[PDB]
Amino acid sequence: CPDPVYTCRPGQTCCRGLHGYGCC
Numbered sequence: 001c002p003d004p005v006y007t008c009r010p011g012q013t014c015c016r017g018l019h020g021y022g023c024c
Contacts, residue, residue, distance in 0.1 A: 001007065001014030001021060008014065008023030015024045 001023075007021065012023040015022055017024065
């Protein structure tokens with residue numbers, strides 16, 4: 001999640017694990 005806009009909740013880190021961008 002390089003872009004400024006956040007897809008997930010704040011605080012949580014964005015991980016590119018699963019096929020789809022997620023927050024873990």
